[PDB]
């Protein structure tokens, strides 16, 4: 199906005291299936390895709409210095699996180990793409710490 999985809000200012961040990935149109939905942290200004924080980057289960996910980030307390550290948090191009639907399954036996589904020329593969689960427009999670921050009006 059309699957569309976004962040609750593009940026999101915690404390560094705060040990473990939530966010919940949403999805817009829902979910019916097995889709697993990978996240990667990108490192902006602050560092990774567990520095500022502790990058994290796996797949999210998201089997039917009912049930939502979070993305649980280390935050270190760390009392170093003044940085503008911030560090975004993208997702990854979800993949639906089989068995979690009704009727119409997609088998998935054509896969290639090196990379692509469709591991022959441009048979429609990009409306085959089209027909897979995605991200929403713009979703981005740009994760921001340090010693004294700002907090904005955060509300939904």
Same mark, same amino acid.
């Given at each position: 199906?059309?699957?569309?999985? *976004?962040?609750?809000?593009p940026?999101?200012?915690?404390?560094?005291?705060?040990?473990?961040?939530?966010?919940?990935?949403?999805?817009?149109?829902?979910?019916?299936?097995?889709?697993?939905?990978?996240?990667?942290?990108?490192?902006?200004? &602050?560092?990774?390895?567990?520095?500022?924080?502790?990058?994290?980057?796996?797949?999210?289960?998201?089997?039917?709409?009912?049930?939502?996910?979070?993305?649980?980030?280390?935050?270190?307390?760390?009392?170093?210095?003044?940085?503008?550290?911030?560090?975004?948090?993208?997702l990854?191009?979800?993949?639906?699996?089989?068995?979690?639907?009704?009727?119409?399954?997609?088998?998935?036996?054509?896969?290639?180990?090196?990379?692509?589904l469709?591991?022959?020329?441009?048979?429609?593969?990009?409306? &085959?793409?089209?027909?897979?689960?995605?991200?929403?427009?713009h *979703?981005?999670?740009?994760?921001?710490?340090?010693?004294?921050?700002?907090?904005?009006?955060?509300?939904?």
């Open positions: 199906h059309a699957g569309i999985f *976004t962040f609750e809000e940026v999101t200012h915690v404390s560094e005291s705060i040990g473990i961040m939530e966010v919940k990935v949403l999805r817009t149109s829902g979910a019916r299936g097995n889709v697993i939905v990978p996240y990667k942290t990108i490192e902006g200004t &602050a560092r990774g390895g567990g520095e500022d924080f502790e990058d994290t980057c796996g797949e999210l289960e998201f089997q039917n709409d009912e049930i939502v996910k979070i993305i649980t980030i280390r935050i270190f307390d760390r009392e170093e210095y003044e940085k503008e550290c911030s560090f975004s948090l993208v990854e191009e979800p993949k639906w699996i089989r068995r979690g639907m009704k009727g119409g399954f997609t088998i998935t036996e054509e896969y290639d180990d090196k990379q692509p469709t591991s022959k020329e441009e048979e429609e593969r990009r409306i &085959a793409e089209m027909g897979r689960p995605i991200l929403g427009e *979703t981005k999670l740009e994760v921001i710490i340090e010693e004294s921050y700002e907090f904005k009006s955060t509300v939904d």
